[PDB]
């Protein structure tokens, strides 16, 4: 597959990196620290859902929906990460601290997967656009 100017593939990798960062960094981060790397992970998502929203009109109406869904689904997953982040802050100093972090990771993770799912959902979408 030709990775010339497929904006979406790059943003994806970008995002996935951002998550991974967080994954490995959080172990060594202060409470104020989280907020930023999640912001990073938040931002890369904005670039993605951005480029995808432009590619959209040039797709089979069928897939056009299938994607807008995994789009709105992606948002629900970020929000869960944000929530699970706030928990980690007001519980930074408690015996609960160790779990919320896990949940934060799980959240960032499931966000990353659903991003890949968005990818494939667009690929197949492009395939059908060609068959036309």
């Amino acid at each position: 597959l030709d990775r010339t100017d497929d904006l979406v593939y790059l943003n994806v990798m970008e995002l996935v990196r951002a998550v991974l960062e967080l994954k490995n960094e959080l172990s060594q981060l202060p409470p104020e620290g989280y907020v930023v790397v999640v912001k990073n992970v938040g931002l890369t998502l904005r670039k993605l859902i951005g480029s995808v929203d432009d590619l959209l009109p040039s797709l089979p109406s069928s897939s056009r929906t299938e994607i807008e869904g995994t789009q709105k689904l992606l948002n629900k997953d970020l929000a869960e990460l944000i929530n699970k982040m706030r928990l980690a802050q007001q519980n930074a100093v408690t015996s609960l601290s160790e779990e919320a972090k896990r949940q934060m990771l799980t959240a960032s993770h499931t966000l990353a997967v659903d991003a890949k799912n968005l990818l494939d959902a667009v690929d197949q979408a492009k395939v059908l656009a060609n068959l036309a």
């Binding site: 994806v12 990798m13 996935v16 991974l20 994954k23 990353a112 997967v113 890949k116 990818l119």
Partner: peptide, 11 residues
Amino acid sequence: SELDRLLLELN
């Protein structure tokens, strides 16, 4: 390829 590579790492 790298996306598969990175996702491999997460797992």
